[PDB]
């Protein structure tokens, strides 16, 4: 049977009584290795999470832009619990940031410059 080269992807084949299979190169799987293990396929992560799939390909991580957490980025981060906020200025956390409003005389992201 495994004359006919039936594994896919470079798998390899070994005859068997049952049947042929197959021993699939990773991250090819499945009956004649023709299915791909591909845990970033459908988009899991949110908010510009970067996918990153695992060295079985059995899972996925997610990369968090600045800012977002969680499995999938879906969580916002508060940066005003330990405030990054400069020279008397006051923080309001937003969904997906922070604005710092700045007391007299001082400007900046933070109130910094
Ligand atoms: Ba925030």
Redesign the pocket.
């Known amino acids: 049977e495994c004359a006919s080269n039936p594994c896919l992807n470079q798998g390899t084949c070994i005859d068997d009584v049952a049947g042929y299979k197959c021993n699939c190169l990773l991250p090819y799987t499945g009956a004649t290795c023709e299915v791909v293990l591909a845990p970033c396929a459908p988009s899991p992560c949110r908010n510009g999470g970067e996918c990153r799939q695992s060295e079985d390909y059995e899972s996925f991580s997610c990369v968090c832009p600045t800012?977002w957490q969680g499995q999938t980025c879906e969580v916002?981060?508060?940066?005003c619990v330990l405030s990054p906020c400069r020279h008397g200025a006051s923080c309001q956390?937003?969904?997906?940031?922070?604005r710092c409003h700045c007391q007299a005389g001082y400007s900046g992201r933070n109130c910094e410059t």
């Open positions: 800012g916002d981060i508060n940066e956390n937003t969904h997906g940031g922070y």
